[PDB]
Amino acid sequence: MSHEDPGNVSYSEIGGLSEQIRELREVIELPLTNPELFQRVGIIPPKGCLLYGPPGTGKTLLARAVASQLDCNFLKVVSSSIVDKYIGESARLIREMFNYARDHQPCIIFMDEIDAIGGRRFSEGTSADREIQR
Amino acid sequence: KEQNGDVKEAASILQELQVETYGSMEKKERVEFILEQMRLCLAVKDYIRTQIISKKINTKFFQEENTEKLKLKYYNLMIQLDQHEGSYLSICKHYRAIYDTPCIQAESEKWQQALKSVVLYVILAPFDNEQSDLVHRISGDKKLEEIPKYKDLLKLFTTMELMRWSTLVEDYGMELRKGSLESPATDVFGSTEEGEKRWKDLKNRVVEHNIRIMAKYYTRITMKRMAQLLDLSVDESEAFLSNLVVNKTIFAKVDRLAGIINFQRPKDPNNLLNDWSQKLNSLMSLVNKTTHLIAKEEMIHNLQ
Amino acid sequence: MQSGIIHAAEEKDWKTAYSYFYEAFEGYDSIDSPKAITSLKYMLLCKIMLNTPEDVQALVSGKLALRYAGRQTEALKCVAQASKNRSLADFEKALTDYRAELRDDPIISTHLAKLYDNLLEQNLIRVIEPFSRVQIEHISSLIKLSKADVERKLSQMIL
Numbered sequence: 001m002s003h004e005d006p007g008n009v010s011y012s013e014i015g016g017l018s019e020q021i022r023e024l025r026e027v028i029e030l031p032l033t034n035p036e037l038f039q040r041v042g043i044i045p046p047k048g049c050l051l052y053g054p055p056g057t058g059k060t061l062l063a064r065a066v067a068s069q070l071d072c073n074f075l076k077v078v079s080s081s082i083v084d085k086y087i088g089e090s091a092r093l094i095r096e097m098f099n100y101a102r103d104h105q106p107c108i109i110f111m112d113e114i115d116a117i118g119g120r121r122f123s124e125g126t127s128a129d130r131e132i133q134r
Numbered sequence: 135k136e137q138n139g140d141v142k143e144a145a146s147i148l149q150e151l152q153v154e155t156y157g158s159m160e161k162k163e164r165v166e167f168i169l170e171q172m173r174l175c176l177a178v179k180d181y182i183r184t185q186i187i188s189k190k191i192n193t194k195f196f197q198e199e200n201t202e203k204l205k206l207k208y209y210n211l212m213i214q215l216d217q218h219e220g221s222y223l224s225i226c227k228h229y230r231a232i233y234d235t236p237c238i239q240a241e242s243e244k245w246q247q248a249l250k251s252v253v254l255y256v257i258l259a260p261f262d263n264e265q266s267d268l269v270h271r272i273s274g275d276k277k278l279e280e281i282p283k284y285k286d287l288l289k290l291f292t293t294m295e296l297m298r299w300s301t302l303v304e305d306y307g308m309e310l311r312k313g314s315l316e317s318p319a320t321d322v323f324g325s326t327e328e329g330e331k332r333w334k335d336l337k338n339r340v341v342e343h344n345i346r347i348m349a350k351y352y353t354r355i356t357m358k359r360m361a362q363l364l365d366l367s368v369d370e371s372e373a374f375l376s377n378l379v380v381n382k383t384i385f386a387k388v389d390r391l392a393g394i395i396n397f398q399r400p401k402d403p404n405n406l407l408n409d410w411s412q413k414l415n416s417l418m419s420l421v422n423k424t425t426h427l428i429a430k431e432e433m434i435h436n437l438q
Numbered sequence: 439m440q441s442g443i444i445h446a447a448e449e450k451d452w453k454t455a456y457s458y459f460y461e462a463f464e465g466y467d468s469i470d471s472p473k474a475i476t477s478l479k480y481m482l483l484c485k486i487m488l489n490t491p492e493d494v495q496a497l498v499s500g501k502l503a504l505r506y507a508g509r510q511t512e513a514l515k516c517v518a519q520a521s522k523n524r525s526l527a528d529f530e531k532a533l534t535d536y537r538a539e540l541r542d543d544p545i546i547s548t549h550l551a552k553l554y555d556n557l558l559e560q561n562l563i564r565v566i567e568p569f570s571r572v573q574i575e576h577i578s579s580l581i582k583l584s585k586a587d588v589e590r591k592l593s594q595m596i597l
């Protein structure tokens with residue numbers, strides 16, 4: 001909860017892609033400010049979103065700017081926190097994470113470099129390949 | 135309003151009502167609009183739909199603190215639908231809410247007839263434990279006893295006993311020409327079919343009320359005595375006792391061939407009868423023993 | 439549907455007989471109306487065969503039965519209502535106007551004779567319940583029937 005993103009101004013300086021920003025502004029900000037519009041239509045608010053690169057760049061910047069624009073609460077997690085050396089209990093630390101996500105809600109959570117922690121276990125091998133699957 | 139509407143035109147607005155309920159919140163004007171179609175639904179003659187759209191109104195309640203006083207005047211439209219067909223009890227609790235409009239009044243004639251309208255449905259409602267404590271809330275009021283017919287009304291309820299039904303018609307048959315207030319009798323006797331159904335209702339209520347004391351006082355009775363007691367033929371008594379036995383409100387066995395009829399006494403062959411009776415009676419003087427003990431103990435210490 | 443008819447002539451299982459007609463109606467729904475309107479008659483009648491008229495009104499009150507409501511569903515509701523009210527006179531009064539729908543019953547003798555044998559004691563439980571000692575001649579006037587077969591049926595009720 002100690003992550004610091006400058007801007008504000010930095011949010012105005014990123015430029016492209018405009019319409020992508022106009023998608024994320026909505027999917028992120030609208031469900032919080034106007035939950036009433038969703039319950040009328042019957043549409044469920046999207047609970048997740050995927051932003052990938054680098055065909056171009058600007059992923060982390062843009063989302064990080066939303067943290068400082070929407071204000072409210074923001075939570076940043078580095079992908080290096082999943083291993084925990086022996087006893088991969090950090091898996092249950094995800095349950096802790098979602099515990100306080102249910103307390104401090106609303107909140108925004110970032111997941112960067114998910115390919116290391118969300119791989120496909122295609123070739124069964126070594127050891128820690130499996131713990132990540134857990 | 136152009137074509138004055140019909141079954142189809144009133145149905146076009148129906149599907150459009152709920153479109154803006156979840157679209158936006160409007161305090162007053164919308165409510166006034168959402169009650170506009172049911173008053174046309176009475177002219178549609180279809181009641182099963184009128185009760186659905188009226189079921190959308192109750193979730194909007196409580197509407198008080200806004201208007202105040204107009205929406206309290208709409209209940210006069212709702213009681214019309216509820217009083218119509220199947221329920222006399224549904225108007226019971228709601229007429230105490232239509233009684234809150236003369237509370238702000240500032241009006242005498244409307245209020246004075248509001249009291250009779252709220253007091254006379256007790257007979258039209260089937261007896262229930264909720265009715266018992268319902269009538270006690272209205273009893274004892276300072277404004278209520280102003281009506282002399284209210285003393286007759288109350289007399290039939292308090293401690294029961296018996297009365298001639300024709301002498302009852304002497305008091306309640308004058309109220310048609312009497313008035314001042316003719317509105318309660320305008321609802322009862324306004325429609326010949328309505329008035330007749332409430333005549334048989336009053337009869338059913340008085341004969342049912344004569345029964346519940348007989349149920350506590352018997353023991354047994356001759357059949358022919360109940361006929362002269364209820365001022366009707368024995369065949370009519372057979373009909374009455376058939377409905378009372380299928381309502382299983384009171385168990386009885388009434389033998390027509392031998393003339394011996396009775397309500398209860400419950401069988402209770404051995405166990406529970408002697409158990410409760412004998413034992414609790416014996417415990418009376420036992421638990422009262424220590425009670426009068428301290429009575430003499432204090433009296434003797436007052437003078438010594 | 440045929441599974442239902444054969445089970446109705448077999449009379450062995452009155453439960454699954456309603457299940458077969460229910461599924462058959464699920465097949466006939468949304469495509470062919472004439473088969474869907476005639477499918478409800480058998481399911482509701484087999485529920486009357488089970489002596490459970492209370493659930494009939496609950497099935498016809500759903501939004502699915504309102505589109506298919508018609509002159510036949512009132513003939514089903516009136517048999518459910520006469521069995522609930524336990525009155526043969528109302529049943530016979532409605533039996534003449536709905537006889538056009540009564541002829542579609544493949545076997546009119548089975549359901550009517552079993553229902554008559556049933557409604558017999560459903561009319562007896564009203565006259566018997568109020569008092570234990572009862573004369574046969576005056577109580578037979580309510581049901582309007584000779585005393586012979588009546589005593590035969592009562593003794594059967596003891597058996």
Ligand SMILES: Nc1ncnc2c1ncn2[C@@H]1O[C@H](COP(=O)(O)OP(=O)(O)OP(=O)(O)O)[C@@H](O)[C@H]1O
Nearest residue numbers: 013014015016017053054056057058059060061062
């Ligand atoms: N739209 C933009 N406006 C301003 N600076 C930008 C923009 N896009 C990228 N940058 C510069 O790129 C740097 C990193 O941003 P970003 O998160 O896009 O890199 P990245 O996604 O890690 O790149 P890659 O995915 O190739 O590793 C920032 O320091 C910023 O100065």
